[PDB]
Amino acid sequence: IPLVNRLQDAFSAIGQNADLDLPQIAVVGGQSAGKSSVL
C-alpha cells in the first residue's frame, strides 16, 4: 500500500484537523468519451 495512503491513515488516527493538501483532480473530455467510467 502506498506510503501517502499510510500517512493519511496516520493523520486520521491522530485526528488533528490537518491534511496533506493534495491538489484537486478534474476529469474532462468530449461527450461519450468515457470520463465517468474512468473516474
Binding site: I1, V4, N5, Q8, D9, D19, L20, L22, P23, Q24, I25, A26, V27, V28, G29, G30, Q31, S32, A33, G34, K35, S36, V38, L39
Partner: protein, 96 residues
Amino acid sequence: VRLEIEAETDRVTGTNKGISPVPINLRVYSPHVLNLTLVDLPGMTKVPVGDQPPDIEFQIRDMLMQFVTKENCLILAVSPANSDLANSDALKVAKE
C-alpha cells in the same frame, strides 16, 4: 447511490437532456484513500440537442473552465481511440 445521483440531476436539469452548472457536492468515505477532491464534468458539445439553449457549447466550456482554470487542479484529458486524436475536445482545453 447512483439512482440518487441521477434523480438529483433530473430534479433540476429536467428529463430532456438539459444540463445545469450547479454542482452536486458528494462525499465518500473509505479506509485507504486520500482526502482527494474529484470533479466529474459534462462532456463538451457544439450542437444543442433536446431542450438545451443554443449556446450549450459556451455554457459547458466556461462551466468546466471555472473548475479547471484554477491552479492545483490536475487534469484528466479523456479521449476515445475512435475519433482521430486531433479532434480531442479534452486536449484543446488541456493545452489552452
